[PDB]
Amino acid sequence: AFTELQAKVIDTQQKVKLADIQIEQLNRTKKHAHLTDTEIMTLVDETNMYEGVGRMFILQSKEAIHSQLLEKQKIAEEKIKELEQKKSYLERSVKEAEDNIREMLMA
Amino acid sequence: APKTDMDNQIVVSDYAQMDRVLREERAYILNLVKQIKKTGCNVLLIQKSILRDALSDLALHFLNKMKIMVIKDIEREDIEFICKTIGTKPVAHIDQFTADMLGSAELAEEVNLN
Amino acid sequence: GGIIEDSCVLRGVMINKDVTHPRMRRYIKNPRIVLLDSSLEYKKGESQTDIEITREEDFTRILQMEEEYIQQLCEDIIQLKPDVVITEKGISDLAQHYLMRANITAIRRVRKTDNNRIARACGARIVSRPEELREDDVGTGAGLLEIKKIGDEYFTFITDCKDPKACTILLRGASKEILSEVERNLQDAMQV
Amino acid sequence: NLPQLEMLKNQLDQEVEFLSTSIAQLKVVQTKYVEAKDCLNVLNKSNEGKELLVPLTSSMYVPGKLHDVEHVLIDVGTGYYVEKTAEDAKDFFKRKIDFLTKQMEKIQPALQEKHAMKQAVMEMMSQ
């Protein structure tokens, strides 16, 4: 029966679609969280520098920020691959049932 | 407090009115209770809530939350038996909250056991 | 189509019932017609099943956990050299796609008597331990699988039966009536 | 055959978008859950006494001096404010993800089947 063969190709279809759009900004928000560090690295030192996780800008030493923000680089730096790991298998998984659709038809 | 669709009086169109009429409803059932603890009661005889028109949990919450031990859901004829045999005089009203109409028990406990 | 004249046995069981069209190749001679019987559903753990797909990497990791156990189940089928594989209910799309990776058609969600017909058609058994598989289990002998259009419908013939022969009555009427008149009296013989 | 499935196709596409629209928006409500947790993360991370630039009002923001880390809100009840403990609020900052994710994620397979119900009508509408 091709129903679940048509059912699996629909679900894993929209599964893989997310890993493509996110991975690049994850490289960006990697690169930008390097840049925003370089952006505060622009002015050699300041107390009025802020890094924050919310509407609050909690006053922080840009140094600990350079760590935190290259850490924030490292945050989005990692998420590219776990998507690419998502991006890797899900592309094949949708065709798993599709491989079952067509062979049985070629059969 | 007065009913429409619950102990909370609800006029039904948009939800701020029924939210504000709470200020009406909430304060009363609090004060009506505050009035219950004014004269004060250690036990409250409360007959069944169908031997009531209805009993505000909103009150009844803050009622027992002013720390008065209560029995609800009791037969009024129990109460009638209780109004006589222990001489707890019938209280239909807060003027009727009085140390005479509020019966004096030597000890009042609950046993879930034996 | 056909006529009771050219109506004549093929070995095992000639499979009309679920066949309106080939689901099993077209014509298969040596390659084994194979019965996969339930127990092709995944195990996300070793013998176990853990939490299933939810978000990003579970789609990867879990549906992979589902796949290995079945790929492990898959191999034992391909190891006995099938091409057509008739899997009754209890199939994974995981179970087919490596059968697809070996380009060995895995025929899913088809009835029991039909598979028992097919278990009588090549006369193979029905797999009682789908985790450890044998060609002695399913696809016995050399076997045959032949899906033939005779009149309207493609008709799977799984033949060259092991189990003591086996043979089913080929019923070809011109109409189904001139078919049926024979079969009803045929029904006397086959009972006698 | 065809016109009734021309008529019936109308609602199934909405049943698609009914489910399509809803599931997407609960991640937005989850954004604040990890946010406030993270806003409480770096809150406890640094100290009390850091300057806080907090929203004054649109086009503006106001500074401020943080004297409380462990003082942290949760929004539960109805219109209600529970200021919680740093770990308390985090726990609900955490946990409010958990229940909302359940109501959110359940919507996606139902999204498919409404289309699979619409797509089935599409065929029988075209066939």
Add this chain to the structure above:
Amino acid sequence: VEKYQQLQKDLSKSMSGRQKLEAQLTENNIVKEELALLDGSNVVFKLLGPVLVKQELGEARATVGKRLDYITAEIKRYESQLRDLERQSEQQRETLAQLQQE
């Protein structure tokens, strides 16, 4: 016909925030929790009106008990207009259907 659809908006009207309640209803169980979970460790506020009202447990204790009860109360007001609106639009359905067919 509009008669089919006529009272369904008035219907879902009273149903709209009633649904919103039922999450608040669920979180009213949670604020009962998070009040009981707050011994005063961090401030408890009924937020009512654009003014922040400094509040207490016992001030919010009956309240969240009253809220949850009240957050069950806007249920019944719809339950009032639930069978008002769905039932009369149930009669209207045949009224202008045939007339327009006529």
Add this chain to the structure above:
Amino acid sequence: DQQKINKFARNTSRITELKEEIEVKKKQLQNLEDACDDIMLADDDCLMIPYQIGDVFISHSQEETQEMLEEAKKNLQEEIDALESRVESIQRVLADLKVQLYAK
């Protein structure tokens, strides 16, 4: 296009325009009363009463809130009635743009 009709629509335009900023201000004034009610609901006098403006909540007595709450009311209420006679003036020309439309 017919002269009155352009004015009619432009006047029919303005009639709505003016009662717009009239009506939006009722419930806030009403909420300012509700806000007076909500502090009055619980913790009437019995504690600090902060009042919320921006991110800061100004600690004070009970009555200063309602005072500020009653304050914005009449202000906001004068804003209500500011366009009220402006609704009065606008539709009186519209009825003419109704009259002179069928008259011309």
Add this chain to the structure above:
Amino acid sequence: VLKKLDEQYQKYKFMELNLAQKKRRLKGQIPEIKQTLEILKYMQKKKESTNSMETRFLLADNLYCKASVPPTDKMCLWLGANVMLEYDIDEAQALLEKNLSTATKNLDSLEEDLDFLRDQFTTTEVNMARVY
């Protein structure tokens, strides 16, 4: 021509209302940033810290933090498009007055765009209706 008047009849009144709503979004960004004035001007303070008051600091949506706020006299104003500066209470005052009017005239501008789009559509229509 019968085509000129009605195409003038239709579009001009049609756009007469269109001239109102683009004036209604003239005033759309007016009260939004107008309330911002109050939130600032209340909290505007001299001789003490600007907004010296008590607060629950808004860190996030589900989150606040109790404290004594008091800052110096300053306000960090969002002007849009990834640009913030640190202003003091007055630059905060006046530059906030600006998000009133320059936002007021954002979609205000599309009104007089629709003023002549009221005018230009009929004229191009009727001449093209002659081409018709």
Add this chain to the structure above:
Amino acid sequence: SAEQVIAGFNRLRQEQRGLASKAAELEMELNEHSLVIDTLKEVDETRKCYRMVGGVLVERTVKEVLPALENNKEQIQKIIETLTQQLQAKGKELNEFREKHNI
């Protein structure tokens, strides 16, 4: 005959009516870039100027924060005209196909 006459009577009208479509479409795009620079470039930038990022409020000066609003504002204004002319040329072609159906 009368089928082609309405087509150009449509397409110029589509261009004609589309004069309103591009009127409202690129408006707010222009509006936001300005208010920013209109509010920023007016008020004193002379001291330190924030680079504003959501998770990181960067400390910089005017020299850095000021020019960023000038350049891509003009760059975006160049690009925005295309999609509408596409949508209008699509509006030109699409509605050119639509009037052709029912004769």
